[PDB]
C-alpha cells in the first residue's frame, strides 16, 4: 500500500522502473480517498470555529515571527503552512472564493469539508466516488436554482444606502471592527459608491487607498474623499496648510535637464564655463517662474528636487511635495481633477488640479507627517484612513474593510440578495431533500448527503454561539417548512427573533452561489483523485 512497486523480479535480476522508486511513496484506491477526506475534514474543522458573529480568531505566526490575528479564512489558509496536497486544494479553494467574491472564504472550506465528510460515509456503503460527485453536482444545481428562487433584491442607488449599510454590517458582524460596526459599514458603502461606474459596471479597487497608521482609536478611522500621502512639504519653513490649492502635478525632477542618450557637454573656455553656470541658474529660475505663471499654489513632483529649486519654491510662496510615488501621483491627479505633466514647458492653468484643502498632519510624539488632499469637487478617488492601538487590529481592520468593499462591489454587480444566518443553507437543504424524494434511489444517497452537508453552516453558527446545534437547526427547519419563510435561521446574537429578514442579516446571492459552486467543483475534483505518488 506504499513504496511504489516491490517485486524486484521473478527471475532474481534487478527491477528498476521509476527513478528513486525506493524513496518514493504511493497511495491507491479507497485509502487514498480516506486520507484526502481526513485532511479536508481537519482543515474544515479548524476553520469552522471562525464562522459567524460569535466566531473566534486565529493567530498566525510566519517564518520570521510576525503575528497576524484574523477571522478571514483566506488569510488563515494562506498563512497556514500545509504540506498535504488536499489541504493545499482547500487553500486554493478559499483563495478562489476571495478572488471572485471577497467574502465566504470560510464558508467554502467548511462546506467542502462537510461534503467530503459525508462522501466518506457514502464510500463506506460502497458507492463509486464518481457517482457521489455526480449526485453532488445535481444537488448543487438544485441549490443554486433554489437560491435564485428565494433571492431578494436591494436598491444600489446612492440615495438609499440603508440596504447597503445593512449588507456591509452583516459582512462586518464577524470581524473585530464591529466595535465601530456602523461607522465601518457606512464608509465601505460610501467608498464603493464614490469610486464606481455605477451602470452595473466594475469597481476598480485601485481607486480606494486603504492606509493605516498606528495611533489614535478605531473610531478615528474615516473616509477622505481624496488622497493621503506619507510625505510632507519639501522645505521645513513652508506652510503646513493650503486652502483653495491649485495643484501642479509633475513627473519632472526640478533639476537641470538631462538627455537619456549618452551625452558629453564639453567646456573648452572660461566663456563656456560662465555660460554653463548661468544656464543652470536660469533653468532653476525658469522652472519656478513657469510654475508660478500657471497660477499654481502647490506643486507635487514624483522625482524629488534640489536645494536651489527648494529654496526658490519657498521664496515664491509655492509649497511643494517631492518623491511622491507613481500610484499616489495618479490618485492625486484623479482626485483633484488635474492632469499629470511631464515637463514644465507643458504646464498650463487647465492641467492643474484643485483641492479645497491640502494639510500636513501629525501623529503625536512621532516626527511622522502625512499629507491630506481633500475637499475636491468630484474626486473619483477615495482613501480609508485607519487608526488603532496596534498593528494587528489595523491589519485586521484593513482586511475586514476589504471584505465589506468586496460585498458592496458584488451588490453593484448584481443587486440580488439572499438572507443569511444559515437560513439560505437550510432552505437549499430542504429543496435538495424535496428533489431527492423524486429522483431514483441510487442518486438519492448523494443528494441527501449534499443536504446534510449544507446543513453544517447553521450547525456551525449555533455551536459557535453556544446554542445546541441539532435542537436549533431542527426547530428552524420545521418552522421553515411550516411557515414558508427562507429567512429563518440561527439567532447568533440572541435578538429573540429567528427571522434574519428582520434582523437585517443579508448575504449576496452571488456569494452563496459561488460558495456552493466552488465547494462542489473542488469536492468533485478531490473525489476524482484515487492515487498519490509523492516523493
Amino acid at each position: 500500500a506504499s513504496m511504489g512497486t516491490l517485486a524486484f523480479d521473478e527471475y532474481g535480476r534487478p527491477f528498476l522502473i521509476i527513478k528513486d522508486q525506493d524513496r518514493k511513496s504511493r497511495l491507491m484506491g479507497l485509502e487514498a480517498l480516506k486520507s484526502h477526506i481526513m485532511a479536508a475534514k481537519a482543515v474544515a474543522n479548524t476553520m469552522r470555529t471562525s464562522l459567524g458573529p460569535n466566531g473566534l480568531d486565529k493567530m498566525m505566526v510566519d517564518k520570521d515571527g510576525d503575528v497576524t490575528v484574523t477571522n478571514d479564512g483566506a488569510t488563515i489558509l494562506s498563512m497556514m503552512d500545509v504540506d498535504h496536497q488536499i489541504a493545499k486544494l482547500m487553500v486554493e479553494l478559499s483563495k478562489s472564493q476571495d478572488d471572485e467574491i471577497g467574502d465566504g472564504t470560510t464558508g467554502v472550506v467548511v462546506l467542502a469539508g462537510a461534503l467530503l465528510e459525508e462522501a466518506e460515509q457514502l464510500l463506506d456503503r460502497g458507492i463509486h466516488p464518481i457517482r457521489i460527485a455526480d449526485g453532488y453536482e445535481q444537488a448543487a444545481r438544485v441549490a443554486i436554482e433554489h437560491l435564485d428562487k428565494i433571492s431578494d433584491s436591494v436598491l444600489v442607488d446612492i440615495k438609499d444606502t440603508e440596504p447597503l449599510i445593512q449588507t456591509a454590517k452583516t459582512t462586518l458582524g464577524s470581524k473585530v471592527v464591529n466595535s465601530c460596526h456602523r461607522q465601518m459599514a457606512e464608509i465601505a458603502v460610501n467608498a464603493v459608491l464614490t469610486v464606481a461606474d455605477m451602470e452595473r459596471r466594475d469597481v476598480d479597487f485601485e481607486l480606494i487607498k486603504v492606509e493605516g497608521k498606528v495611533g489614535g482609536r478605531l473610531e478615528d478611522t474615516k473616509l477622505i474623499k481624496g488622497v493621503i500621502v506619507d510625505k510632507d512639504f519639501s522645505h521645513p519653513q513652508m506652510p503646513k496648510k493650503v486652502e483653495d490649492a491649485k495643484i501642479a502635478i509633475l513627473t519632472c525632477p526640478f533639476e537641470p535637464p538631462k538627455p537619456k542618450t549618452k551625452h558629453k557637454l564639453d567646456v573648452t573656455s572660461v566663456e563656456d564655463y560662465k555660460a554653463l553656470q548661468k544656464y543652470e541658474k536660469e533653468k532653476f529660475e525658469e522652472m519656478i517662474q513657469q510654475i508660478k505663471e500657471t497660477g499654481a499654489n502647490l506643486a507635487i513632483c514624483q522625482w524629488g528636487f534640489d536645494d536651489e529649486a527648494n529654496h526658490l519654491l519657498l521664496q515664491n510662496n509655492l509649497p511643494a511635495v517631492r518623491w511622491v510615488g507613481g500610484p499616489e501621483i495618479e490618485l492625486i491627479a484623479i482626485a483633484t481633477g488635474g492632469r499629470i505633466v511631464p515637463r514644465f514647458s507643458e504646464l498650463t492653468a487647465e492641467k492643474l488640479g484643485f483641492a479645497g484643502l491640502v494639510q500636513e498632519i501629525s501623529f503625536g510624539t512621532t516626527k511622522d507627517k502625512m499629507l491630506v488632499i481633500e475637499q475636491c469637487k468630484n474626486s473619483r478617488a477615495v482613501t480609508i484612513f485607519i487608526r488603532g492601538g496596534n498593528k494587528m487590529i489595523i491589519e485586521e481592520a484593513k482586511r475586514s474593510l476589504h471584505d465589506a468593499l468586496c460585498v458592496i462591489r458584488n451588490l453593484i454587480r448584481d443587486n440580488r440578495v439572499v438572507y443569511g444566518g444559515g437560513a439560505a443553507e437550510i432552505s437549499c437543504a430542504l429543496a435538495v431533500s424535496q428533489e431527492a424524494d423524486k429522483c431514483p434511489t441510487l442518486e438519492q444517497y448523494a443528494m441527501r448527503a449534499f443536504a446534510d452537508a449544507l446543513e453544517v453552516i447553521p450547525m456551525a453558527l449555533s455551536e459557535n454561539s453556544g446554542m445546541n446545534p441539532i435542537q436549533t437547526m431542527t426547530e428552524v427547519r420545521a418552522r421553515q417548512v411550516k411557515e414558508m419563510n427562507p429567512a429563518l435561521g440561527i439567532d447568533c446574537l440572541h435578538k429573540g427573533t429567528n427571522d434574519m429578514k428582520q434582523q437585517h442579516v443579508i448575504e449576496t446571492l452571488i456569494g452563496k452561489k459561488q460558495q456552493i459552486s466552488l465547494a462542489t467543483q473542488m469536492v468533485r475534483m478531490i473525489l476524482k483523485i484515487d492515487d498519490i505518488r509523492k516523493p
Epitope: 428562487k149 428565494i150 431578494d152 433584491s153 411557515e483 414558508m484 419563510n485 427562507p486 429578514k501
Partner: nanobody
Framework: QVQLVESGGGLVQAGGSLRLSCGAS????????MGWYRQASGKQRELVAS???????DYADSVKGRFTISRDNAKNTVYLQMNSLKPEDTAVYYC?????????????WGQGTQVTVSS
C-alpha cells in the same frame, strides 16, 4: 412566471349568491396575500376583500358582512362566496397574489372574470 386561473361567472338575482375561485401555479415559494378586485366599464378597480396567510381577512366599506372568502394553503388557492348580488356588483372580478417577500414587483393579477347576464 406565476400562472393564475380563475373560475367564476353565473350572476343570479333570485336571492343572490355566487362563488368564484382563483388558483395559482408556477415559480414562487410563498403567497403572502390573495385579493379579489372589481373593475367595471368606466370605473376604477377596487378591493372586494383580501385574506392573509394567517387567514386574517379585511373587507371593504361599500360591501361587508356577507363575505365568505376562504384560503386553501395546501394548494395556494382562494374561494369567494359572495351573497346578496345586485346590478352594481356586475363587473370583472380580478385576482391578486403577492409573493416572495411581498415587494411591489410581486403583485400578480389574473385575467379577470366578467359576470354574465341573461336577457
Amino acid at each position: 412566471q406565476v400562472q393564475l386561473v380563475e373560475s367564476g361567472g353565473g350572476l343570479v338575482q333570485a336571492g343572490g349568491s355566487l362563488r368564484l375561485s382563483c388558483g395559482a401555479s408556477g415559480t414562487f415559494f410563498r403567497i403572502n396575500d390573495m385579493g379579489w378586485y372589481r373593475q367595471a366599464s368606466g370605473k376604477q378597480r377596487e378591493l372586494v376583500a383580501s385574506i392573509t396567510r394567517g387567514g386574517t381577512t379585511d373587507y371593504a366599506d361599500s360591501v361587508k358582512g356577507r363575505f365568505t372568502i376562504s384560503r386553501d394553503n395546501a394548494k395556494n388557492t382562494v374561494y369567494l362566496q359572495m351573497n346578496s348580488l345586485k346590478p352594481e356588483d356586475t363587473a370583472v372580478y380580478y385576482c391578486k397574489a403577492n409573493r416572495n417577500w411581498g415587494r411591489e414587483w410581486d403583485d400578480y393579477w389574473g385575467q379577470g372574470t366578467q359576470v354574465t347576464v341573461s336577457s
